[PDB]
Write an enzyme that holds these catalytic residues in place. Structure first.
Site, PDB file in Angstrom:
ATOM      1  CB  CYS A  88      20.039   0.053  73.670  1.00 39.33           C
ATOM      2  SG  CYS A  88      18.371   0.556  74.173  1.00 39.33           S
ATOM      3  CB  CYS A 236      12.458  -4.541  70.618  1.00 36.86           C
ATOM      4  SG  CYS A 236      13.831  -5.227  71.549  1.00 36.86           S
TER       5      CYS A 236
HETATM    6  O1  LIG Z   1      15.470  -1.228  71.349  1.00 35.83           O
HETATM    7  C1  LIG Z   1      16.239  -2.016  71.975  1.00 35.83           C
HETATM    8  O2  LIG Z   1      17.141  -2.634  71.345  1.00 35.83           O
HETATM    9  C2  LIG Z   1      16.147  -2.173  73.457  1.00 35.83           C
HETATM   10  C3  LIG Z   1      16.261  -3.553  73.981  1.00 35.83           C
HETATM   11  C4  LIG Z   1      15.443  -3.512  75.199  1.00 35.83           C
HETATM   12  O3  LIG Z   1      16.119  -3.985  76.352  1.00 35.83           O
HETATM   13  C5  LIG Z   1      14.991  -2.099  75.379  1.00 35.83           C
HETATM   14  N1  LIG Z   1      14.890  -1.624  73.968  1.00 35.83           N
END
Ligand SMILES: O=C(O)[C@@H]1C[C@@H](O)CN1
Ligand SMILES: O=C(O)[C@@H]1C[C@@H](O)CN1
Ligand code: NA
Ligand code: NA
EC number: 5.1.1.8
Lengths: 310, 310
Positions: A88, A236
């Site tokens: 994450c 993300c």
């Molecule tokens: O920044 C990331 O990698 C995660 C992935 C998502 O499930 C939530 N944010």
């Protein structure tokens, strides 16, 4: 009654609830082994921590663990409203910034163990954090998908620490005011994947869907549907990691070159990759800010002590 | 940087964030006067307190205030993701249970000042709370409404501490697994009211919509759309107050008779009304449970320090 001590932070708008005390003992195995025990024996605790009423569907939790390796500053297990994550990126940035807030680490380089391998985080003087992620790669390219509402789309299937389906030819407007339609679209995409039996390597469930579009102020803007159907408020980290592998394989980004990724709400990450032999190593930089210091209280008389919902 | 000290609780699953320190001073006027000042001068503070990332669209906030009357134990102003409330039944129950948690009151009868009048709350030995609410009344009955894509419906307009439109003939299935459709349906209802210029008394904006249905274990089950388009997880204290007024007017509930109201998630309030003159006095009883003790931290370098969203 029972207490769970946490540091809430957010990374570009995407929240992380770092549990620093109060969860069950998970033993001394690898983070991957501890995840299995956490899920099998104590999944109610995940639900207490991040589901309504003490959490929210948006929330991602991070359980702080003592690592196995002596040169690691920490281990972590990440979870959300539906289950467990691998890596994450936003949560690692949150974890590091939270450890600093607690006075447990200083600026510099830190190794963090995760269920998908050890990552290296650098806490900079500006308090932003660079994460050197686990290796990323593209598994399949331009996989065709029939969407009843919209017809054909093509997407890449790629690993960035979680499994992603990445689409550019979606024709959807990516902006905060459109997240309801974007959520429905990406849900239709995941449904189509499941119907066609499409997976990542070794039958890996593709549980994240990301859409990409042009942005006037970044290289790209994205929308990311997470496994429990909440969207990622951040650009993300693992999703952008997957994107780097796809760009690289398409001949569109070379090692060391910067890529600026904006989120559906306008927050940004900067990223690049390095090549170590055959492996592509994504490096993400972003900032987290502390949201709250909290002690969750689990009242045994509360009918929703272990969370609301199915 | 700046700190906001809160007690988070929930009443039948509906959360209350009770702010016990950290908000700007609002003077020594009535709660109504302080509300005016909070909104005009300090609305950014509501946003930091209850919007993402430090809050949630679901969250209702309650600012603890020193009351004007010496016989009152507290004053309160309630707010949500869109603006300000009048009274708040679930929130009053949360406030009283939180004051007990903090050791500031014991079991007994307490008067609470609000922007729409003083209410009386009784903290019982079992730690449930009875709220003797402000008077409730029906303004208009069986108002016909045309719903494009749905059909036509009839609703009552009633005041229970906020303004409600109450519908029985909606034909919708009330259950937690259907909140997406129920949210869209009630949003369509509010749109239809606005289109037709339909208001409460003195042009009062009807900003809560409630649907009612039969329930095998209660007198009724409801779904309530709140002003900022989130639903009430609780049976809704002010909405149930308005319901009692309508039942009374229709000859279907007499003074002192019990009425058990279930919420969309299955939590329950018991209620009855008393008559004082022409006035109908709703009395709601329910329980809150403490969720967390938290200190929100407002970092001036955080781009979302005053909240995300329009
Ligand atoms: O920044 C990331 O990698 C995660 C992935 C998502 O499930 C939530 N944010
Ligand atoms: O219980 C009540 O009265 C309030 C009204 C809603 O806005 C939220 N809950
Ligand atoms: Na651009
Ligand atoms: Na019944």
């Amino acid at each position: 009654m029972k207490k769970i001590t946490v540091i809430d932070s957010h990374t570009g708008g995407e929240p992380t609830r770092l549990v620093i005390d109060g969860f069950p003992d998970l033993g001394r195995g690898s983070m991957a082994e501890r995840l299995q025990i956490l899920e099998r024996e104590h999944d109610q605790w995940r639900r207490a921590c991040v589901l309504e009423p003490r959490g929210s569907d948006v929330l991602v939790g991070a359980l702080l663990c003592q690592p196995q390796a002596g040169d690691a500053c920490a281990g972590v297990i990440f979870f959300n409203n539906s289950g467990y994550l691998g890596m994450c990126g936003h949560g690692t940035i949150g974890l590091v910034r939270s450890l600093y807030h607690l006075g447990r680490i200083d600026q510099g380089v830190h190794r963090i163990e995760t269920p998908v391998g050890t990552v290296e985080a650098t806490l900079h003087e500006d308090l932003s954090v660079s994460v050197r992620n686990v290796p990323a790669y593209r598994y399949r390219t331009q996989v065709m998908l029939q969407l009843p509402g919209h017809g054909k789309v093509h997407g890449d299937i790629a690993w960035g620490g979680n499994w992603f389906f990445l689409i550019s030819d979606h024709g959807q407007r990516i902006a905060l005011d459109n997240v309801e339609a974007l959520t429905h679209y990406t849900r239709d995409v995941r449904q189509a994947l499941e119907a066609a039996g499409i997976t990542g390597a070794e039958g890996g469930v593709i549980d994240h869907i990301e859409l990409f579009a042009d942005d006037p102020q970044a290289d790209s803007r994205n929308f990311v549907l997470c496994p429990g159907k909440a969207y990622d408020r951040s650009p993300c980290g693992t999703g952008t990691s997957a994107k780097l592998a796809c760009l690289a394989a398409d001949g569109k980004l070379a090692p060391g070159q910067a890529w600026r990724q904006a989120s559906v709400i306008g927050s940004q990450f900067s990223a690049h990759y390095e090549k170590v032999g055959e492996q592509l190593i994504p490096i993400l930089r972003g900032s987290a800010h502390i949201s709250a210091e909290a002690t969750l209280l689990l009242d045994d008389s509360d009918p929703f002590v272990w969370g609301i919902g199915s």
